[PDB]
From a paper:
Wild-type SAASoti and its monomeric variant mSAASoti can undergo phototransformations, including reversible photoswitching of the green form to a nonfluorescent state and irreversible green-to-red photoconversion. Photoswitchable, photoconvertible and multi-transformable proteins are fine tools for multimodal measurements using super-resolution microscopy. Reversible photoswitching often proceeds via the cis–trans isomerization of the chromophore, associated with the change in its protonation state and plane distortions of the π-conjugated system. Photoconversion is an irreversible photochemical process of peptide chain breaking, leading to the formation of a new π-conjugated system and a redshift of the spectral parameters.
As it was shown in the previous study, C21N substitution abolished a dimeric fraction of the mSAASoti at higher concentrations and resulted in the true monomeric protein. The crystal structure of the C21N mSAASoti variant in its green on-state was obtained at 3.0 Å resolution. The analysis of crystal contacts demonstrated that SAASoti is a monomer supporting biochemical data. The mSAASoti has a typical β-barrel fold with the chromophore 66HYG68 resided on the central α-helix. In spite of the moderate resolution, the electron density clearly revealed a maturated chromophore in its cis-conformation as well as conformation of nearby residues. The chromophore is fixed with a number of hydrogen bonds with neighboring amino acid residues. The oxygen of the chromophore carbonyl group is hydrogen bonded to side chain of H120, while oxygen of imidazolidone moiety is fixed with side chain of two arginine residues—R70 and R95. Histidine group of the chromophore forms hydrogen bond to side chain of Q42. Finally, the OH-group of the tyrosine moiety is hydrogen bounded to side chain of S146. Noteworthy, the orientation of the chromophore’s tyrosine ring is stabilized through stacking interaction with side chain of H197.
Residue numbers in the entry: 5 to 65, 69 to 222
């Protein structure tokens, strides 16, 4: 009956382009969905070494990795076994705009993640094209039901080389392939850390938990 276990495996294939630089990445990883914790190692197979900040991709490489308390409906764990997809728009403060889509399927113990990524209008000596991002700041995303599906808005900042912050607005729409119990408006706190990039291979780690307002 439980299609998602305490320990999951992760596979990822990403194809995309940024400013007309095409690339392709594969990665494998391990996760504990009920703890909201996961990690990855990615390997760039085309376009490497990446000429842009890995950070614009990192949040693209699954809301099932979020500790959901009882009394918040878990949209993501309930979408299985059929799975769910999501689309996301990234509007960066310097005009850079990224559209991304993703399919997530379930095969026994392994999440299979299908990511397409298009970024455009990133300035030549911006922090993205010159790869001067350090990390995303920890975040809290707001999840609301809209057109019968879950939506997820978050204002996000990248810390830059030498300090200072580079703002981005996320709009993610989550589409379950199936009729699930709909959640209320709630939040999901996030924290991603990017270890060990070298252009070609990188490590990701993320902790996320869903919570409510303190009414």
């Amino acid at each position: 009956k439980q299609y998602i276990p305490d320990d999951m495996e992760l596979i990822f294939h990403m194809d995309g382009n940024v400013n007309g630089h095409y690339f392709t990445i594969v990665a494998t990883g391990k996760a504990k969905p009920y703890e909201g914790k996961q990690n990855l190692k990615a390997t760039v197979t085309k376009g490497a070494p990446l000429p842009f900040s890995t950070d614009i991709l990192s949040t693209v490489m699954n809301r099932c990795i979020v500790h959901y308390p009882p009394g918040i409906p878990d949209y993501f764990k309930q979408s299985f076994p059929e799975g769910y997809s999501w689309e996301r728009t990234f509007a960066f403060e310097d005009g850079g705009f990224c559209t991304v889509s993703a399919d997530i399927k379930l095969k026994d113990n392994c999440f299979i993640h299908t990511s397409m990524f298009h970024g455009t209008n990133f300035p030549a000596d911006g922090p993205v094209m010159q790869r001067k991002t350090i990390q995303w700041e920890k975040s809290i995303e707001k999840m609301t039901v809209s057109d019968g599906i879950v939506k997820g808005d978050i204002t996000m900042f990248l810390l830059l080389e030498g300090g200072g912050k580079y703002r981005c607005q996320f709009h993610t729409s989550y589409k379950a392939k199936k009729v699930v119990e709909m959640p209320q408006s709630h939040y999901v706190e996030h924290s991603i850390e990017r270890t060990n990039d070298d252009g070609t291979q990188f490590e990701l780690n993320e902790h996320a938990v869903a919570r409510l307002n303190e009414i």
